[PDB]
Every structure is written in C-alpha cells, then in structure tokens.
Amino acid sequence: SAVPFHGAHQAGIATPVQDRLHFAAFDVTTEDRAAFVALLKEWTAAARRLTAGHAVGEGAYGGLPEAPPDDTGEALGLKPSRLTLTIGFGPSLFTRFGLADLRPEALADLPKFPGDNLDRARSGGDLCVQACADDPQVAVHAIRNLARIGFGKVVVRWSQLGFGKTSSTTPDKQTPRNLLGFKDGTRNIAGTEKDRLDRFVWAAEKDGTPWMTGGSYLVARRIRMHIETWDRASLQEQEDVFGRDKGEGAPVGKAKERDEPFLKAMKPDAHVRLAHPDSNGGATLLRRGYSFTDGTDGLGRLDAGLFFLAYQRDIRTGFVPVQRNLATDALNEYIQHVGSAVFAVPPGVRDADDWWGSTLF
Amino acid sequence: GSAVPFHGAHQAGIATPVQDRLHFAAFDVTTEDRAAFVALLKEWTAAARRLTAGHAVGEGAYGGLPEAPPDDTGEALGLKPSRLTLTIGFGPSLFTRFGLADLRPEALADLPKFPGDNLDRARSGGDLCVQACADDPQVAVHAIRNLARIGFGKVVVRWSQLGFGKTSSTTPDKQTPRNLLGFKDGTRNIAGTEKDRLDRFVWAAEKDGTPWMTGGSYLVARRIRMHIETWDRASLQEQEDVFGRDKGEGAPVGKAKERDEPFLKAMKPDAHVRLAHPDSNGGATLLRRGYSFTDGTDGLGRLDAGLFFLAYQRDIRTGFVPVQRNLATDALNEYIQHVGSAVFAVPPGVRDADDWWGSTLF
Numbered sequence: 241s242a243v244p245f246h247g248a249h250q251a252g253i254a255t256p257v258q259d260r261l262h263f264a265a266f267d268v269t270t271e272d273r274a275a276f277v278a279l280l281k282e283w284t285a286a287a288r289r290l291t292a293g294h295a296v297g298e299g300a301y302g303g304l305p306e307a308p309p310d311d312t313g314e315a316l317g318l319k320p321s322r323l324t325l326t327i328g329f330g331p332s333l334f335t336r337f338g339l340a341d342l343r344p345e346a347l348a349d350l351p352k353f354p355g356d357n358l359d360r361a362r363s364g365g366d367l368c369v370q371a372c373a374d375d376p377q378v379a380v381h382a383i384r385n386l387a388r389i390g391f392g393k394v395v396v397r398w399s400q401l402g403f404g405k406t407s408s409t410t411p412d413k414q415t416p417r418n419l420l421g422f423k424d425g426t427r428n429i430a431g432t433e434k435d436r437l438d439r440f441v442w443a444a445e446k447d448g449t450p451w452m453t454g455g456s457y458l459v460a461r462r463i464r465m466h467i468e469t470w471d472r473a474s475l476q477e478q479e480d481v482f483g484r485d486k487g488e489g490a491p492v493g494k495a496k497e498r499d500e501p502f503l504k505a506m507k508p509d510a511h512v513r514l515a516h517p518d519s520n521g522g523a524t525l526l527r528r529g530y531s532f533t534d535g536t537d538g539l540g541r542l543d544a545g546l547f548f549l550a551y552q553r554d555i556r557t558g559f560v561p562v563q564r565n566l567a568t569d570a571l572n573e574y575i576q577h578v579g580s581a582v583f584a585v586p587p588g589v590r591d592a593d594d595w596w597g598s599t600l601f
Numbered sequence: 602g603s604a605v606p607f608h609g610a611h612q613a614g615i616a617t618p619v620q621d622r623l624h625f626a627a628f629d630v631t632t633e634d635r636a637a638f639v640a641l642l643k644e645w646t647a648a649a650r651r652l653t654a655g656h657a658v659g660e661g662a663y664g665g666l667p668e669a670p671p672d673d674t675g676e677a678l679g680l681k682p683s684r685l686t687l688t689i690g691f692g693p694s695l696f697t698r699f700g701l702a703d704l705r706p707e708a709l710a711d712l713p714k715f716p717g718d719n720l721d722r723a724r725s726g727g728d729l730c731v732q733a734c735a736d737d738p739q740v741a742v743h744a745i746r747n748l749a750r751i752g753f754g755k756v757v758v759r760w761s762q763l764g765f766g767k768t769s770s771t772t773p774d775k776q777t778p779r780n781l782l783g784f785k786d787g788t789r790n791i792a793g794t795e796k797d798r799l800d801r802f803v804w805a806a807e808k809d810g811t812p813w814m815t816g817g818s819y820l821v822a823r824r825i826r827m828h829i830e831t832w833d834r835a836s837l838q839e840q841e842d843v844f845g846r847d848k849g850e851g852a853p854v855g856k857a858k859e860r861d862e863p864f865l866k867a868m869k870p871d872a873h874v875r876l877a878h879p880d881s882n883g884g885a886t887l888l889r890r891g892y893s894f895t896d897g898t899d900g901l902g903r904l905d906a907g908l909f910f911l912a913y914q915r916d917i918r919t920g921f922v923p924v925q926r927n928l929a930t931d932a933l934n935e936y937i938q939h940v941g942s943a944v945f946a947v948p949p950g951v952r953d954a955d956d957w958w959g960s961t962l963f
C-alpha cells in the first residue's frame with residue numbers, strides 16, 4: 241500500500257513496479273543556487289507527504305479562505321497507491337550553479353543512433369521526476385503539485401503518462417504484455433537480486449563520483465510503435481522478429497517462457513539475440529518502462545508505443561553498447577525513437593532531515 | 602474483474618457503473634457500399650461479444666496459420682474482461698450516406714454556437730463512434746485497435762480521446778470521484794438503478810417520433826480544457842464560490858454533508874450548481890459520464906489538462922442544449938474552454954446473439 245520514501249537508495253528503482261507512470265522533465269529558470277537548494281528542500285518535504293498519502297502543506301482545504309489551497313485537492317480520499325517519487329539531474333543542470341566539474345563521467349551524452357528521430361521538444365531536460373503509482377490520478381496529482389510548488393523556479397519541459405499491468409485484475413505471478421503482443425520483462429534484473437543491482441545498477445564509490453554513491457543513471461527513450469504495420473505482419477514474422485513465440489513467450493525451440501534461451505536457434509537479427517548480455521560482453525540493464533497510448537495522429541494512426549526506461553551503474557557500459565548492438569535489429573522496421581533523455585539519479589533520502597540532492601549541494 | 606453483459610434492451614456503457622478508464626474513438630466511413638457497411642456492422646458486434654467476455658476476436662491471438670497475421674493483435678491475452686463495455690453511436694453526417702437522410706431523428710439536433718466556443722474541427726464531428734470503457738486501459742485500447750483493424754478500408758479513425766480516470770458516477774453508493782479542479786463530480790447525477798428517471802430523461806421512446814431509436818439514447822461530447830494555472834492561483838473561497846459546494850466534503854453551501862439537497866438561493870447568482878440544476882432549467886436532467894484527460898505539456902511550461910465531457914439524454918433539444926445555454930453566465934467559464942464537440946445517436950441494445958448493432962436502422 242505504501243513504499244518507504246527514505247532509504248539508502250531512492251525508491252522507485254528496485255521497488256515493486258506499480259501500475260501507472262507519470263514522467264516529467266523540468267527546466268530550471270533561476271540562476272540562484274540558494275533559490276534552487278531551497279526548492280529541493282521544499283520538494284522533499286512535499287514528497288514525504290505525497291508518498292504517505294497526505295496533502296501537501298497545510299492541506300487541500302480548511303485554511304484562510306482568502307489564500308489559495310496549499311494542495312490542489314484531486315487526491316483527497318485516495319490511498320498512497322504505492323506512490324514512489326524519483327528525481328534525476330540532467331546534463332544541462334551542471335552548466336548552472338557552477339557545478340560543471342561535478343558532472344559524473346558516467347552521465348555520458350548519447351550518440352546519435354541509426355534511425356533516431358529525436359523530437360527536441362520531448363527530449364532532454366534539466367531534471368526529472370518519475371512518479372509511479374497504481375492509481376494514475378495519484379501520480380498526476382504529485383506531478384501537478386510539484387510543478388505548482390516550483391513555479392517561477394522551474395517549468396515542465398515535457399510530460400509522459402504510461403501504464404503497465406492492472407494489479408486489481410492481473411497476477412504478480414504473470415508477465416505483462418507490451419502493445420506488440422509479446423510478454424515483456426522475462427529476462428530483467430529483479431529487485432530481489434541485491435548482487436545484480438550492486439554490480440549492474442547502483443553507482444559505487446570507487447566508480448569516480450562520490451556524491452553519486454547509491455545513485456544510478458537513467459536513460460529514457462520515447463519509442464513510437466508502427467502498430468498498423470506490425471498488425472499486418474504474419475505471426476511468423478513477429479515471432480521471427482523477437483526470437484520468442486507469441487503465446488507462451490518461450491525462446492524458439494524451448495517450451496517454457498523462462499527456459500534459458502539458445503541464441504544460435506534465433507535469426508541473427510532477432511531482438512533477444514542482439515539485446516542479450518552474451519552478445520554484449522555482459523552488459524545488463526534494469527528495464528522499468530511503460531506502454532503509452534497518447535491518442536491518434538492526423539492520419540488515423542495510433543500514437544502508441546513504449547516509454548523505455550533503463551537504470552544502470554554506467555551509461556557507457558549499459559545502454560550505449562546494447563543500443564548500439566541493435567543497429568540491425570529486425571524490430572527496427574516497426575519502431576522509431578522519437579524522444580530521449582539521460583539523468584543521474586542521486587542516492588536516497590536517508591532520514592527526515594535529509595533532502596533531495598544534498599550530497600551534491 | 603467481472604464481465605458486464607453485452608446484450609439487453611439498451612446498450613451497456615450508459616447506465617452501467619462508471620469504469621475507471623476510457624478510450625473514445627470517432628470514425629468516418631470510407632465506403633459508399635451499404636452492404637459493405639452492414640457487413641462491417643455484423644462483424645463488429647461479433648468481435649464485441651468476444652472482447653466484452655475476455656476472449657480473442659476470430660481464431661485467437663496465436664496458434665493459427667504461421668504465414669498469416671493473427672486474428673487478434675494479442676495484447677489483452679491473459680487479462681480479465683475488466684468490466685469492458687463497448688457503446689456505438691451514429692453521427693449526423695452519416696445520414697447523408699446510404700440514403701439514410703429521412704431516418705435522422707429530430708432529437709439528433711446540431712448544436713448551436715455557444716459563447717466561448719472554440720472548436721477544433723479536427724477533433725470534432727464524426728460519422729460514428731465507439732465508446733470503450735474498462736477498468737484496464739490495455740483492455741480498452743485493445744478493443745478500439747482490433748475494431749479499427751477489422752474496419753480497415755470501410756472506416757477510418759477521425760480522432761480519439763483517452764480518459765485516464767473517471768469524473769462521473771452512476772452509483773451514488775460508492776465514493777464520488779474528483780475532477781482535476783479538486784471537487785467531487787457526480788454527486789447529483791442519474792443513477793443506474795433509478796429506472797424511473799432513466800426512462801424519463803435518457804432512453805428514447807417510441808412516441809418520441811423516431812421508432813428505430815426506441816430504447817436508445819442521444820450522446821453529446823464536449824472536449825473542455827481547464828486553465829489550471831489560473832485556477833490554482835485562486836483562493837479557496839473563490840473556488841468554492843464558483844461551484845456552490847465546498848471543496849472538502851462537497852456539500853451545498855451552508856449544508857454539512859455532500860448529499861444534503863442544495864438550497865439554491867444561498868448560492869451566488871452565477872454559481873455552477875445553481876445554473877446547471879434542473880430547477881433552474883425547467884427540469885432538464887442529464888446523465889453525466891465524463892472522464893479526465895491530460896495530453897502532455899502545452900509547450901508553455903505547464904500541464905495540459907481538462908475534462909472529456911459526455912452526457913446521455915432522451916433528447917438533445919431538451920437535455921444539453923438548454924442546460925448549456927443557461928451556463929452562459931457561469932462563473933466556471935472563466936476557467937474552462939470548450940475545444941471539441943460532437944453529437945451521436947446511440948441506438949438500442951443488441952437483443953440477442955442473432956441481433957447486431959444498428960439492425961433497427963438498417
């Protein structure tokens with residue numbers, strides 16, 4: 241029902257995946273370091289209440305009738321719904337407040353990749369809040385109120401709602417399906433593998449940027465799916481594209497979805513074969529992404545796809561090589577990357593006196 | 602997780618309890634072949650029967666011929682029905698085709714212009730529509746997708762709207778939801794158990810002049826943007842004055858409980874509840890069934906939010922049009938703008954497994 245906000249790490253990374261996502265990048269409008277630190281503290285105070293299901297500040301009502309409510313109200317009477325709020329700091333943030341020399345090496349800018357069609361308006365950002373919850377309105381309310389609290393000091397650059405499973409109907413003993421119709425998540429790092437998070441996800445002190453020990457690095461890609469094209473392809477084309485069958489999700493020739501894959505049995509350009517760590521010198525990702533359907537465009541097509549999110553200990557040893565190994569992926573015929581951003585995710589709020597980003601400021 | 606029954610005198614999705622998610626879709630028809638269209642109509646009903654029960658359309662999502670695309674796009678596999686309802690309606694522009702002109706109901710009136718109106722003609726109008734409501738958005742999407750797929754070449758999607766969470770209620774025994782302005786929305790609506798009020802204000806009758814519309818209803822849909830920036834810098838008193846109810850409990854001004862009957866003369870002359878209330882409109886009553894939406898940023902540093910407003914009524918001329926006309930002086934106007942519109946006739950329900958959608962019109 242509620243995920244502990246405080247911790248060595250921020251919640252929302254290795255904690256159970258919630259049903260809905262509301263992702264927002266902000267740009268910073270102030271040049272004042274003090275102003276900004278002030279805001280980070282206020283934001284942390286508000287996260288504490290939100291994640292515990294209380295209104296922000298003095299509340300949503302019952303105040304001076306001649307002042308606007310501290311909290312906008314639309315969450316009154318809902319449960320915290322496993323709300324987690326994770327903040328990240330984008331590369332452009334380190335050009336302000338004189339932090340240029342504190343940018344971590346691992347927060348590397350992404351190359352341009354074959355096929356990229358990055359929309360600048362839906363790319364980048366000085367910082368980000370990932371808001372995950374089982375109730376979409378709880379998620380929206382958090383983002384809405386944080387934007388409200390930071391107004392005049394930050395603005396929302398771009399926004400993405402996503403959804404995964406519906407927990408009030410689907411078993412946790414069950415893998416969700418992406419909008420292409422294949423199980424998605426079968427081979428991933430799971431929050432239970434302290435060993436794999438420590439090795440593959442968390443930033444380590446001896447990695448090079450001490451303020452980031454306990455943090456992680458986030459890569460975000462808005463990936464539109466060409467659905468009407470995909471739906472016209474034969475069942476065998478689709479299975480051929482991934483290296484797994486559609487119904488059970490098993491690696492070709494195997495019979496259970498969770499049978500270890502035999503990579504030589506898959507077509508050389510199969511998605512699973514190209515993404516697999518054995519084809520990538522061990523590179524392994526924690527994927528934590530959501531499907532989106534934003535509507536339909538001016539030509540009658542479903543504007544839908546996968547808001548892809550990956551956490552890793554180092555962007556250079558995680559996303560960049562795997563993404564690069566996808567240059568010839570058969571999936572490329574059916575997807576286009578149209579947004580992208582990277583963020584360093586600072587370590588957690590240790591206690592009630594800690595604040596977001598304290599290790600950096 | 603239950604399934605909602607698909608057959609009945611009336612289509613589901615109207616008086617049915619309001620499900621969490623919405624995916625609305627307006628279609629324009631791209632065939633002139635009446636037989637082409639009726640065959641579409643019979644194929645859609647058949648899919649809809651499978652979809653509302655939790656099954657795949659046609660031969661299923663996998664296991665068919667390898668060389669052939671699956672009948673069902675597959676992303677609902679292993680998911681429950683989720684109380685999915687599929688509701689279809691016919692826009693006024695449809696009767697220009699197939700020689701249907703004389704069958705247009707009088708009650709499917711075009712809406713006049715309203716002050717403040719600012720209607721994007723792209724996200725407006727429509728030959729027909731499918732309203733898909735479900736508690737799982739994947740389920741809702743999968744239905745519209747597979748429906749559009751089956752109709753490729755006979756209909757195309759003109760526009761759609763996703764509703765990420767409800768702001769209506771047809772079940773006054775469960776908690777009322779709040780809209781994006783923070784107030785409860787749905788308190789004094791029509792409930793699915795008030796059979797008397799449903800006949801009086803929602804279902805079309807044989808005597809109403811168009812017989813094939815018997816047992817159906819008429820749908821108005823308005824896309825209404827909210828100036829949340831403006832609203833969020835208004836005082837609590839200003840906000841509460843605009844509606845006439847308080848924000849926390851939702852009670853009429855001066856009363857104590859959300860469901861106490863509003864005493865309209867204590868409300869400001871231009872308070873929303875006072876103007877919308879049927880006693881101020883000669884008894885005009887609506888069935889509200891709308892959803893909240895947010896469609897990213899606005900590119901000006903703020904969230905783009907609003908309400909996708911849907912109302913079912915026995916006759917548009919005595920439902921939405923008079924109540925909306927009275928809202929011309931509504932204090933809420935300062936914070937909203939209407940930016941899409943469309944009306945549909947929703948026909949009777951599919952009586953049994955040999956019936957089909959529109960069978961009474963064709």
Ligand code: HEM
Nearest residue numbers: 418422423424425426427463512515516517546562563575
């Ligand atoms: C629309 C875009 C994508 C779709 C539909 C998709 C789908 C899938 C599917 C069905 C699987 C097999 C089941 C599983 O998740 O383990 C998979 C695995 C995987 N994908 Fe993707 N993927 C997409 C994009 C990406 C991107 C952009 C990357 C990396 C930059 C990526 C990396 C991986 C990895 C590492 C695996 C695990 C393979 C293994 O170790 O067995 N995917 N993906």
Ligand code: HEM
Nearest residue numbers: 780784785786787788789790825877878879908924925937
């Ligand atoms: C963003 C747009 C709107 C918002 C936020 C809004 C909000 C509200 C609220 C808070 C209530 C009070 C509780 C309830 O009975 O549900 C209400 C009632 C009502 N509203 Fe609206 N409304 C909007 C637009 C409209 C429109 C366009 C119409 C009709 C054209 C309308 C008609 C009504 C009616 C008939 C009632 C019931 C009055 C009664 O019998 O007490 N509203 N609305």
